[PDB]
Each structure stands twice: as structure tokens, then as C-alpha cells.
Write a protein that binds this ligand. Sequence first.
Ligand SMILES: *[C@@H]1O[C@H](CO)[C@@H](O[C@@H]2O[C@H](CO)[C@@H](O)[C@H](O)[C@H]2NC(C)=O)[C@H](O)[C@H]1NC(C)=O
Ligand code: NAG
Lengths: 20, 49
Amino acid sequence: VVIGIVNNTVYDPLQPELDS
Amino acid sequence: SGWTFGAGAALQIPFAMQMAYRFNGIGVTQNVLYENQKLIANQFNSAIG
Ligand SMILES: *[C@@H]1O[C@H](CO)[C@@H](O[C@@H]2O[C@H](CO)[C@@H](O)[C@H](O)[C@H]2NC(C)=O)[C@H](O)[C@H]1NC(C)=O
Ligand SMILES: *[C@@H]1O[C@H](CO)[C@@H](O)[C@H](O)[C@H]1NC(C)=O
């Protein structure tokens, strides 16, 4: 829906805890 | 440049984004602009009409 959107990763501060 | 030419040096910004700051400044979340942008633009063009 968004005009002119772009692609990048969004970091998740929970992920390294679950990973660890 | 939106409001910024008042304050100083007239920082350029894409118009679609400064309108979404206008929306954000009246408590309507800025995604409402970017989702409905065609409708809002068509409404503005009709109102100038
Ligand atoms: C952002 O990423 C999506 C995928 O996450 C891209 O969508 C793909 O675009 C190609 C064409 O370049 C299609 O062949 C694929 O089928 C699309 N995949 C999906 C899942 O839709 C999208 O093009 C990217 N956009 C930008 C601006 O980089
Ligand atoms: C921005 O302008 C370029 C031309 O200079 C055009 O090709 C592009 O699609 C435009 N992108 C957006 C998001 O308006």
C-alpha cells in the first residue's frame, strides 16, 4: 500500500536473548 | 521545506513526508497519509478545484 517504500532488515532486541 | 524555512535554512523534504508530519502533528498517525495518499491528494486537488 505504501508509495515509495524501501527494503531493510529491522532489528529485534528479543532475538539475541532467545538465540542465546 | 515545510515549516523549516521559517526556523532556518529551509531544509528540503519530500512533500509526501512533510504532509505525513502535518498528520502526525494533529494526532493522526503518519501511516494514515502513506496508506491513503492517493485519496488525500485527490481530495486536495478537488478542493482547489
Ligand atoms: C522488497 O522485497 C520484496 C520481497 O520481500 C520484493 O518483492 C519481490 O519482487 C520481485 C521482483 O523484483 C518478485 O519477482 C518477487 O515475487 C517479489 N516477492 C514477493 C514476496 O513479493 C520487492 O520487489 C522489494 N522491493 C524493493 C523496493 O526493493
Ligand atoms: C522519484 O523520482 C524518480 C525520477 O527522478 C522516479 O524515477 C522515481 O520513481 C520517483 N520515486 C518516488 C518514490 O516518487
